[PDB]
Amino acid sequence: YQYNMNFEKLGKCIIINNKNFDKVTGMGVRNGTDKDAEALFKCFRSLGFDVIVYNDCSCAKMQDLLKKASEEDHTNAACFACILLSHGEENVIYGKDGVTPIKDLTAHFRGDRSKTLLEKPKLFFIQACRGTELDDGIQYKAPVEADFLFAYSTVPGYYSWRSPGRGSWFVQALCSILEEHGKDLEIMQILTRVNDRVARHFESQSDDPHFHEKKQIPCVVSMLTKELYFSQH
Amino acid sequence: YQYNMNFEKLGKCIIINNKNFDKVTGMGVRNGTDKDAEALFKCFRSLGFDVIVYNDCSCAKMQDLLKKASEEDHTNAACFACILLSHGEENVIYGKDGVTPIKDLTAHFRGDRSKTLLEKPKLFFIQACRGTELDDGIQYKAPVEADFLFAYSTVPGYYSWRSPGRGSWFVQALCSILEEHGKDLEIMQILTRVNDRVARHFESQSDDPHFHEKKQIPCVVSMLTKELYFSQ
Amino acid sequence: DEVX
Amino acid sequence: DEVX
Numbered sequence: 001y002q003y004n005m006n007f008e009k010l011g012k013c014i015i016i017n018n019k020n021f022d023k024v025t026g027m028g029v030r031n032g033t034d035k036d037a038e039a040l041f042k043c044f045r046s047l048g049f050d051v052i053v054y055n056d057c058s059c060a061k062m063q064d065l066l067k068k069a070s071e072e073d074h075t076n077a078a079c080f081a082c083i084l085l086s087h088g089e090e091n092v093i094y095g096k097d098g099v100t101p102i103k104d105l106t107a108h109f110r111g112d113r114s115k116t117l118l119e120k121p122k123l124f125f126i127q128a129c130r131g132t133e134l135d136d137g138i139q140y141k142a143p144v145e146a147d148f149l150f151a152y153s154t155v156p157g158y159y160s161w162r163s164p165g166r167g168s169w170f171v172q173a174l175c176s177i178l179e180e181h182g183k184d185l186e187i188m189q190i191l192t193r194v195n196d197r198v199a200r201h202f203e204s205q206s207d208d209p210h211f212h213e214k215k216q217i218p219c220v221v222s223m224l225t226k227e228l229y230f231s232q233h
Numbered sequence: 234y235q236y237n238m239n240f241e242k243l244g245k246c247i248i249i250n251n252k253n254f255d256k257v258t259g260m261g262v263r264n265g266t267d268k269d270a271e272a273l274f275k276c277f278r279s280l281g282f283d284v285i286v287y288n289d290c291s292c293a294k295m296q297d298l299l300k301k302a303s304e305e306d307h308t309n310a311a312c313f314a315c316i317l318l319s320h321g322e323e324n325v326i327y328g329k330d331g332v333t334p335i336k337d338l339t340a341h342f343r344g345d346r347s348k349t350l351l352e353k354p355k356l357f358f359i360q361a362c363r364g365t366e367l368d369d370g371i372q373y374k375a376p377v378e379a380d381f382l383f384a385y386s387t388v389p390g391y392y393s394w395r396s397p398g399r400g401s402w403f404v405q406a407l408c409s410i411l412e413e414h415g416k417d418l419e420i421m422q423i424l425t426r427v428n429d430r431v432a433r434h435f436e437s438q439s440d441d442p443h444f445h446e447k448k449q450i451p452c453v454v455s456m457l458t459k460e461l462y463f464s465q
Numbered sequence: 466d467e468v469x
Numbered sequence: 470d471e472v473x
Binding site: 219 | 376391436452455
């Protein structure tokens with residue numbers, strides 16, 4: 001029932017921290033982002049990952065560094081994890097350069113192209129907008145697509161929220177829960193709890209009242225075939 | 234941490250079983266879908282759902298079934314479940330007469346639209362294609378979008394497999410798991426086991442060979458805010 | 466096996 | 470608060 005975690009290392013954790021964009025993209029500085037990158041790096045380090053933090057990557061950078069990571073040897077790793085922090089739009093995250101489809105980023109790790117992650121969980125946490133809707137609230141051959149989990153900060157077609165001073169809500173919530181339960185809850189329990197937190201704990205504060213008092217719900221997509229605990233535990 | 238399950242009803246479960254299809258769509262007969270729907274009927278009924286099965290619906294009946302269902306009073310129900318069996322392509326499922334967008338069938342239950350289901354789980358299980366790829370194998374204001382789970386039989390962009398004699402893979406697998414663990418496992422554990430069972434136990438048998446020994450993996454999307462057990 |  |  002659980003993924004085998006009995007490996008030399010837990011695995012690699014790549015963090016892409018995109019804060020600054022070319023003006024031509026029309027995207028703004030994402031203040032709050034450096035906090036998220038730090039809290040995430042500290043958190044994933046605690047879990048046991050080898051965390052690497054990249055900053056302000058172009059789209060060609062983002063493709064290449066991810067392609068290479070899938071071309072490494074993960075034979076002694078229990079899993080792999082990638083965290084993206086950027087602007088986005090449906091199906092697509094921004095580099096500083098422009099826009100690239102998420103599917104192209106993650107496909108490098110399909111079973112048929114990163115054979116050493118075959119049968120192991122490959123996790124992606126994505127803090128990015130996914131279009132422009134606002135939520136108002138209300139009062140054994142293995143499938144090559146097997147074993148991914150994508151934890152998006154928000155549901156398709158919606159914006160995602162970031163506090164310049166405190167961090168994105170998704171990330172704040174995630175870290176918070178991972179700190180108290182990283183080592184003792186199953187991954188879905190963790191993310192369910194992160195769902196509850198982003199939903200219960202945050203509400204937009206804004207001058208423009210079009211953007212005022214909005215809510216958010218994250219969106220977890222699981223192709224996993226087993227339960228995942230981070231502690232051999 | 235758990236969704237409150239104390240209500241006098243578990244809730245309504247709608248099963249739409251599309252086997253047939255108007256020639257103008259030129260979609261084939263979904264043989265095996267009847268074993269599916271009957272197995273699903275027995276499972277979800279054991280869980281405690283009030284189950285109704287609607288056969289060969291058309292896009293408008295589907296829209297209407299779910300709009301009307303969203304409109305009942307769910308105040309004494311723990312949750313709501315709907316299962317769709319049909320042809321499909323990306324984002325969209327088939328009525329007997331054409332294709333309708335899944336987003337539309339489910340929006341009816343947004344918390345701003347079906348208030349007596351606010352903070353209650355709404356579940357959709359979807360056995361349908363999602364495009365045309367094959368998998369070869371290797372070795373407290375609440376958000377209006379909160380509390381949905383979509384359990385899809387396959388990942389976006391892909392086919393989904395059905396055996397004329399036994400049923401769709403996703404449904405056979407979901408049903409064996411539910412028979413055995415519906416009452417003791419949390420919904421994500423159950424769906425995780427089904428993901429495992431679909432991946433390991435099935436491989437397309439076929440002529441064409443373009444279609445031979447293909448594999449499938451299901452796809453769970455959760456916006457749930459608590460854990461969901463069907464009993465206690 | 467048929468597809469959907 | 471700002472949007473991504």
